[PDB]
């Protein structure tokens with residue numbers, strides 16, 4: 507009855523009034539590629555390293571089952587599909603979302619959405635959390651807070667699913683194409699602190715042909731950052 | 742993202758752009774009670790006796806998983822829950838639907854919806870097909886044809902699900918109530934043909950059986966079958 511016209515993402519949608527985590531459900535259950543798992547609220551939503559992701563009613567909490575037939579070295583770019591998808595949807599609603607490498611979307615430097623990809627090969631789960639009309643943690647923001655009015659959640663869902671479907675289809679044909687879109691919508695040219703085994707500061711210059719963040723330290727040394735167990739902070 | 746506020750029916754909804762049959766999927770898959778299966782279109786939609794139910798885009802084709810711990814004798818009233826639910830939804834949209842025993846809803850004697858209940862031991866599947874904006878077979882009608890304008894399918898879905906949830910919750914407590922709502926909303930006092938024999942459809946009894954008075958004065962009770970008006 508939703509009348510979705512997408513080719514892959516959204517062929518099937520499983521909705522929950524409440525769930526522990528859409529990513530956990532998606533990873534665990536036997537689901538066809540393109541299946542979208544969405545819930546009004548999550549009781550155990552999570553980000554990277556089991557950090558908690560607040561998921562109250564009013565927001566868009568979903569996961570998408572993917573089985574991308576592309577080289578293993580390209581799988582790390584899946585997170586960008588989610589980030590760009592969110593950015594395109596925000597722009598459709600006249601909200602200036604910008605990417606904080608490699609999985610967050612900010613509006614005026616305040617987090618409005620986060621992406622979490624989990625997947626060991628042939629089954630990849632793309633999780634996306636976007637604050638729409640829900641209350642948010644201090645320092646974060648939402649579409650409602652940005653526009654000054656409630657936003658039809660279903661409309662945001664339709665927009666995002668349509669964008670992701672298109673982005674995914676092109677990714678299957680040309681895995682490298684997404685990098686250009688990320689670059690055009692990413693926060694760059696500013697000082698950042700990279701936190702991992704130790705830490706360093708520098709100018710976030712660009713992302714390379716693999717999606718690695720290129721940082722120029724004051725010494726002139728160039729470091730290529732692989733996203734994994736590393737966080738980025740603005741100075 | 743649908744923000745459904747129902748208690749049982751609609752706690753979960755599985756949507757398909759296309760499916761063979763929502764009833765078949767519901768029967769062969771393990772689903773929690775209240776799970777709603779809905780699809781834009783069915784390729785093998787069916788009615789009674791494996792009859793085909795046309796299910797093109799534009800209509801509401803769904804199935805609901807139920808597991809009511811009520812007496813076996815009450816299970817035959819589940820079909821009425823679906824029928825009355827449809828009637829209530831139609832009224833919300835200013836349409837007067839009338840039930841044709843035991844599973845059809847008519848508007849000015851033209852079929853606008855059909856109900857199909859199937860019990861699989863570990864669950865009961867309540868299937869409902871309602872013509873909204875889709876093309877319908879000759880002799881049938883739809884909400885669009887009755888109102889003269891496209892009707893938001895999601896609005897109809899929300900309305901029907903809310904009505905069914907309320908009907909079902911009460912049914913679990915007062916199984917008898919549904920019959921009275923059915924009597925108040927079904928086509929009676931008219932001559933019908935049961936398949937055969939003809940007579941006046943007088944009413945439904947405490948078991949939901951159609952009571953027919955033949956011209957001889959004989960009274961027959963129908964448990965199941967097709968009714969031609």
Ligand SMILES: Nc1ncnc2c1ncn2[C@@H]1O[C@H](COP(=O)(O)OC(=O)CCCC[C@@H]2SC[C@@H]3NC(=O)N[C@@H]32)[C@@H](O)[C@H]1O
Pocket residue numbers: 526527528529530548550551552553554555557558559560561566567568569609610617618619620621622633634635636637642643646647
């Ligand atoms: N609602 C919210 N809005 C903005 N920031 C939030 C937030 N809730 C938590 N945060 C902050 O963001 C951090 C998490 O950031 P990370 O970059 O690691 O992690 C993320 O940004 C990924 C979040 C992915 C969420 C979706 S919801 C659908 C699916 N089901 C799940 O269980 N997860 C996925 C936390 O440590 C908080 O400080």
Ligand SMILES: Nc1ncnc2c1ncn2[C@@H]1O[C@H](COP(=O)(O)OC(=O)CCCC[C@@H]2SC[C@@H]3NC(=O)N[C@@H]32)[C@@H](O)[C@H]1O
Pocket residue numbers: 762763764765783785786787788789790792793794795796801802803804844845852853854855856857868869870872877878881882
């Ligand atoms: N779209 C339509 N609108 C009105 N009448 C139709 C119709 N499609 C077929 N018919 C006629 O209605 C008859 C079927 O009548 P019956 O009384 O036996 O059967 C019914 O009236 C029950 C139909 C139940 C349909 C739903 S769709 C969701 C779920 N998934 C399924 O596969 N089934 C359920 C056919 O023999 C046709 O003559």
